[PDB]
Amino acid sequence: SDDDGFVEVDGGMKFVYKEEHPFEKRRSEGEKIRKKYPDRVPVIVEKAPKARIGDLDKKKYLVPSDLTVGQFYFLIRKRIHLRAEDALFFFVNNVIPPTSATMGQLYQEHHEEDFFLYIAYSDESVYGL
């Protein structure tokens, strides 16, 4: 007992979506949309702190699970009208996901307790820079 160790609970990253939608309501929607569309995953995308980059009109995406991170990357780039030479990086829990992974795998490994996957985007490869 002298060495009892804390469990470090992971809350994920800060999102406006999480501040504006009560957790219990988020979890209800995440569970239900996964039953409605078992081959898709619900995703929240928001601009990271200090990013200097175009705004993203819509934060909520219902994504076929077999689409890759790289495909979703080009989708988001197009929605913010980024030029090809401009950078865009995604972060899930402060880590850049590999482009070859499926969105389904990223969701399975990293969805939060509300059954959403949370992605932040930035112009920089360091979250918050």
Numbering used by the authors: -11 to 117
Reproduce text from the manuscript describing this model.
The nonstructural small (NSs) protein is the primary virulence factor of RVFV that suppresses the host’s antiviral innate immune response. Interestingly, these searches identified four putative LIR motifs that are located between residues 4–7 (4FPVI7), 59–62 (59FYNV62), 238–241 (238WIPV241) and 261–264 (261FVEV264) in the NSs sequence. In humans, the six LC3-family proteins (LC3A, LC3B, LC3C, GABARAP, GABARAPL1 and GABARAPL2) are key autophagy factors that function by regulating growth of autophagic membranes, recognition of autophagic cargoes, and fusion of autophagic membranes with lysosomes. LC3 proteins carry out their various functions during autophagy in part due to their ability to interact with other autophagy factors that contain LIR motifs.
The ITC experiments demonstrated that the NSs4 bound with sub-micromolar affinity to all six of the human LC3-family proteins under the experimental conditions (20 mM Phosphate pH = 6.5 and 50 mM NaCl) with the exception of GABARAPL2 which bound with low micromolar affinity. However, crystals were obtained by fusing NSs4 to the N-terminus of either GABARAP or LC3A, a method commonly used to examine the structures of LIR motifs with LC3-family protein. In complex with NSs4, both LC3A and GABARAP adopt the canonical Atg8 fold, similar to what has been observed in previously reported structures of their free forms as well as in other structures of fusion proteins with LIR motifs. In both complexes, the predominant interactions at the binding interfaces involve the side chains of F261 and V264 of NSs4, which are the residues located in the first and fourth position of the core LIR motif. These residues insert into HP1 and HP2 on the surfaces of LC3A and GABARAP respectively, which is consistent with most other previously determined structures of LIR motifs in complex with LC3-family proteins. In addition to the interactions involving F261, the side chain of V264 of NSs4 forms hydrophobic contacts with the side chain of F52 (5.3Å), V54 (4.3Å), P55 (4.1Å), V58 (6.8Å), L63 (6.8Å) and I66 (3.9Å) in HP2 of LC3A whereas, the corresponding hydrophobic interactions in HP2 of GABARAP occur between the side chain of V264 of NSs4 and the side chains of Y49 (4Å), V51 (4.1Å), P52 (4Å), L55 (3.7Å), F60 (4.5Å) and L63 (3.4Å).
